[PDB]
Amino acid sequence: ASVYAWNRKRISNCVADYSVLYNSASFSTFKCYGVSPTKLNDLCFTNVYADSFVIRGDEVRQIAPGQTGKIADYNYKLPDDFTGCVIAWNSNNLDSKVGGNYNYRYRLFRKSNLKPFERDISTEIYQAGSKPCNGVEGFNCYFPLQSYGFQPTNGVGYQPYRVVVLSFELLHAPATVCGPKKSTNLVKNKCVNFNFNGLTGTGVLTESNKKFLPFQQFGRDIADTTDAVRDPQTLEILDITPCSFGG
Amino acid sequence: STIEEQAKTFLDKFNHEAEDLFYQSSLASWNYNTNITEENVQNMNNAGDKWSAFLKEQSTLAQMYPLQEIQNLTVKLQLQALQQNGSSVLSEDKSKRLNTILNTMSTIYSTGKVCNPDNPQECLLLEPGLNEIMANSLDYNERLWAWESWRSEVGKQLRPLYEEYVVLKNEMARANHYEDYGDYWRGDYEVNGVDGYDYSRGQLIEDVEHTFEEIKPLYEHLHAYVRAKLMNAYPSYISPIGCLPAHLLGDMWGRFWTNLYSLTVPFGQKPNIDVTDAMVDQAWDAQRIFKEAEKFFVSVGLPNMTQGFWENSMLTDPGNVQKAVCHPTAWDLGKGDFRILMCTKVTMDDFLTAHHEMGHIQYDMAYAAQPFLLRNGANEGFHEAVGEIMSLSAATPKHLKSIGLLSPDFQEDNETEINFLLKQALTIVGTLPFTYMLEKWRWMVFKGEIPKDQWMKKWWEMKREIVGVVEPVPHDETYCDPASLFHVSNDYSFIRYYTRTLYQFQFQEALCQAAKHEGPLHKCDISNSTEAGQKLFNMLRLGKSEPWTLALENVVGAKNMNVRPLLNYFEPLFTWLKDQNKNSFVGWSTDWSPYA
Numbered sequence: 013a014s015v016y017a018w019n020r021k022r023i024s025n026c027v028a029d030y031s032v033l034y035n036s037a038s039f040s041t042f043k044c045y046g047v048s049p050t051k052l053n054d055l056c057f058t059n060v061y062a063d064s065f066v067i068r069g070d071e072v073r074q075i076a077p078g079q080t081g082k083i084a085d086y087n088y089k090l091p092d093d094f095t096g097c098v099i100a101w102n103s104n105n106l107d108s109k110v111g112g113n114y115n116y117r118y119r120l121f122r123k124s125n126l127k128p129f130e131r132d133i134s135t136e137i138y139q140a141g142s143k144p145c146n147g148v149e150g151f152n153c154y155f156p157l158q159s160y161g162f163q164p165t166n167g168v169g170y171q172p173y174r175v176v177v178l179s180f181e182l183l184h185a186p187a188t189v190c191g192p193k194k195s196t197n198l199v200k201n202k203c204v205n206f207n208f209n210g211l212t213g214t215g216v217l218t219e220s221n222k223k224f225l226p227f228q229q230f231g232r233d234i235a236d237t238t239d240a241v242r243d244p245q246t247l248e249i250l251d252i253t254p255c256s257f258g259g
Numbered sequence: 260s261t262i263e264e265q266a267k268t269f270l271d272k273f274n275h276e277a278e279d280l281f282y283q284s285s286l287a288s289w290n291y292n293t294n295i296t297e298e299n300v301q302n303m304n305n306a307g308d309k310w311s312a313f314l315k316e317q318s319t320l321a322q323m324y325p326l327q328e329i330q331n332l333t334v335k336l337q338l339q340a341l342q343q344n345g346s347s348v349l350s351e352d353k354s355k356r357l358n359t360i361l362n363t364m365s366t367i368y369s370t371g372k373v374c375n376p377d378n379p380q381e382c383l384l385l386e387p388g389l390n391e392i393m394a395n396s397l398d399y400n401e402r403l404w405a406w407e408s409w410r411s412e413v414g415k416q417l418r419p420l421y422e423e424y425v426v427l428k429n430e431m432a433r434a435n436h437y438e439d440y441g442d443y444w445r446g447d448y449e450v451n452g453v454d455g456y457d458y459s460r461g462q463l464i465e466d467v468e469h470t471f472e473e474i475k476p477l478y479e480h481l482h483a484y485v486r487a488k489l490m491n492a493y494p495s496y497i498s499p500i501g502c503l504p505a506h507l508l509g510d511m512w513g514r515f516w517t518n519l520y521s522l523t524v525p526f527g528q529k530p531n532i533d534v535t536d537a538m539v540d541q542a543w544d545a546q547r548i549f550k551e552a553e554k555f556f557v558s559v560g561l562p563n564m565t566q567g568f569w570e571n572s573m574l575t576d577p578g579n580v581q582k583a584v585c586h587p588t589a590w591d592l593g594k595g596d597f598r599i600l601m602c603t604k605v606t607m608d609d610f611l612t613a614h615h616e617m618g619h620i621q622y623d624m625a626y627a628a629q630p631f632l633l634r635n636g637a638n639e640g641f642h643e644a645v646g647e648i649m650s651l652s653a654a655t656p657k658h659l660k661s662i663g664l665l666s667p668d669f670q671e672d673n674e675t676e677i678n679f680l681l682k683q684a685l686t687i688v689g690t691l692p693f694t695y696m697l698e699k700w701r702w703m704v705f706k707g708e709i710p711k712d713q714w715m716k717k718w719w720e721m722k723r724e725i726v727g728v729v730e731p732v733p734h735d736e737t738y739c740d741p742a743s744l745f746h747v748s749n750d751y752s753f754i755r756y757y758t759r760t761l762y763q764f765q766f767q768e769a770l771c772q773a774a775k776h777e778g779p780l781h782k783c784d785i786s787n788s789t790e791a792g793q794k795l796f797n798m799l800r801l802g803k804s805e806p807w808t809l810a811l812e813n814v815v816g817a818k819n820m821n822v823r824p825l826l827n828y829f830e831p832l833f834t835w836l837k838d839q840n841k842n843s844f845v846g847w848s849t850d851w852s853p854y855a
């Protein structure tokens with residue numbers, strides 16, 4: 013959608029692989045402000061918000077933490093404590109039109125600068141002077157929404173660029189979106205250390221004949237010492253024995 | 260809200276919609292010139308009429324803003340362009356008569372028609388042929404006859420026509436509250452902005468001749484050399500006291516002596532430095548020509564060329580039904596789109612022409628950030644001066660050997676230096692007196708102190724002293740000689756060319772200092788000096804957003820006008836001519852005539 017009608021999307025309760033998007037050389041601009049993109053795969057938040065639109069190629073500077081501009085002031089504003097990243101890429105091959113892609117419009121005239129995460133949807137004719145504007149444009153009347161004359165031949169700076177701004181919110185509710193875990197393979201009959209689904213400890217893992225009822229995860233016998241565990245990826249009952257020691 | 264913010268909003272609203280429509284019109288123009296076709300003619304009609312019908316209204320609504328309180332002088336100058344009466348201030352009848360009379364002057368000049376007496380049924384034009392014959396010849400009769408006929412069929416019926424044009428254009432000047440149209444022309448070189456940087460229309464007139472007499476010490480010596488070579492070539496047809504007629508100047512208006520250069524060759528043993536054999540032998544095409552020009556500019560300091568230019572711009576071979584006029588042009592269509600248009604050829608002269616046009620293109624990108632009303636130069640002469648700067652810089656022998664155009668073992672001496680300097684001065688300084696006299700004559704025919712009769716006879720009697728043209732057949736009343744000139748009938752300001760040579764001389768001099776070169780200015784190369792390119796960009800990026808007087812403060816610190824580079828460039832020629840025409844006396848007398 014156009015910049016004055018920026019598309020806001022909410023995503024939660026899924027695994028996100030930020031690496032592949034990071035490992036994408038076909039994307040023009042990838043600027044991260046919260047943390048390093050490589051580290052992003054590890055930590056996680058409770059939900060994600062995406063602000064997607066298309067602007068002019070020369071206006072990409074406007075979308076930045078604590079940045080001002082016509083697009084930044086009257087179409088979409090940002091705070092300085094932004095967490096997340098910004099992705100941009102040219103769309104002249106798609107959005108630029110030989111007949112002119114005048115569908116895309118932006119708010120040039122507005123009484124006040126737009127607030128962060130706020131949209132101005134009114135198409136009110138603006139008053140640049142002191143006289144009121146009643147319907148048809150007069151002296152101090154100019155259309156708030158200027159269209160775009162994108163052409164296939166307009167140089168790099170004038171091409172339409174798609175921009176998606178990704179923010180991660182970490183409300184007190186439990187985290188819903190997190191990166192993958194990268195489970196390894198399995199070994200047996202050797203003193204190793206394990207971290208099955210967050211339950212850690214050392215020992216030797218052998219086969220067992222116990223019968224876990226189909227909703228338990230692990231079993232301890234007495235004095236609260238874990239004996240059996242159930243492998244998340246194969247669903248079988250293992251057994252744990254401490255590694256040998258003695259005087 | 261104060262009116263000034265309303266002015267800013269209105270200007271932004273105007274230029275936003277103006278940029279796209281101007282881009283559409285420029286795209287149509289480039290399509291028509293790249294594709295000579297009937298349909299593109301109607302495209303030009305339907306784009307130009309739309310652009311005019313859009314711009315005229317915006318200029319018309321530029322009156323309710325009181326443009327006298329804007330604190331930002333840049334915004335004031337931006338609003339100044341729209342707050343211009345233009346051509347609609349006049350009444351309908353006078354304006355349409357003026358347009359018609361401009362049309363008839365243009366048609367008459369483009370249709371110069373004279374028949375030789377042996378073939379009165381088939382005339383010839385200024386097209387190659389008769390014009391070539393009267394421009395490339397060693398004779399006295401045919402050139403004189405052609406000059407007389409041209410003045411008697413373009414100047415005979417254009418005297419009242421040009422009188423009406425002058426009086427009506429000056430009346431339109433009063434319609435703009437100007438007592439003369441010369442003031443309207445000089446308004447380009449006039450700013451009332453920064454105190455101490457301001458200028459007036461009047462002062463330019465006097466300073467044009469204030470810098471004209473300083474080159475005349477060299478002009479007299481060059482005229483004496485030309486007269487001596489005429490004595491050795493034209494037998495007893497030029498008086499030793501006097502000077503040469505109009506038809507013996509190589510050009511029918513005395514513009515350049517290049518056609519007369521062969522007569523006044525200094526020394527033919529050492530010819531001009533021509534790399535055409537090497538240029539072809541290296542197998543460098545127009546694409547390689549443009550690439551090498553780009554590399555030379557990068558060494559100078561200007562950045563890489565934008566993409567699409569390799570695709571949108573045309574370079575050579577109009578060829579087939581896909582016709583394309585290739586008059587060397589640079590096209591800034593706006594919206595970050597640029598094109599260049601030539602029949603670029605494998606030649607050193609064509610190499611320099613391509614350098615000129617691509618330097619124009621580079622300056623076109625230089626003011627990219629400025630709005631539509633500021634995407635220009637400080638003055639119209641700076642663009643052409645820049646465009647000739649690298650043309651000067653791309654032909655120097657050091658530059659040729661640096662990129663391997665000349666042979667690795669090529670050396671120059673005094674003879675080739677003298678020949679090159681004389682040939683160059685036959686074009687550069689040989690037109691400055693003619694340029695000055697034409698500009699001043701136009702100023703005094705606009706002012707109107709001289710009566711109707713003192714128009715062509717006065718022009719000739721002044722050309723006798725300034726350019727040095729005797730009258731084999733004088734033109735008193737029934738002929739209009741200046742009317743037989745291209746830039747007299749199309750409303751063309753002509754002082755721009757006069758200032759362009761001085762400006763480019765100053766810029767080349769300053770770059771020569773800020774390029775680490777030693778020796779004479781004509782042997783100066785400014786390649787492989789990135790600081791020179793940085794200074795160039797500092798000059799260029801200002802654009803129309805800054806006054807021309809302010810612009811003339813970094814490259815040269817003299818906001819006024821100087822003539823030092825003109826004297827310094829042709830210094831070896833002057834010192835050679837001092838000892839060359841030792842026996843003959845310099846100067847010419849304005850009393851002898853070929854008829855008596």
Ligand SMILES: *[C@@H]1O[C@H](CO)[C@@H](O[C@@H]2O[C@H](CO)[C@@H](O)[C@H](O)[C@H]2NC(C)=O)[C@H](O)[C@H]1NC(C)=O
Nearest residue numbers: 194195196197198226242243244245246247248
């Ligand atoms: C987790 O995914 C793996 C990968 O597909 C599943 O492993 C396969 O499961 C099927 C179903 O029995 C077997 O036929 C394949 O031989 C398994 N491939 C292996 C072990 O490499 C695994 O079943 C999934 N976990 C579930 C469904 O709980």
Ligand SMILES: *[C@@H]1O[C@H](CO)[C@@H](O)[C@H](O)[C@H]1NC(C)=O
Nearest residue numbers: 321322342343344348434435
């Ligand atoms: C244009 O000419 C008219 C005619 O006198 C004048 O009233 C008007 O002020 C002029 N425009 C400007 C901008 O001066």
Ligand SMILES: *[C@@H]1O[C@H](CO)[C@@H](O)[C@H](O)[C@H]1NC(C)=O
Nearest residue numbers: 556557558560561562563564
């Ligand atoms: C121009 O582009 C080429 C290829 O990308 C590069 O090698 C060169 O350094 C560039 N020159 C400038 C001045 O940017």
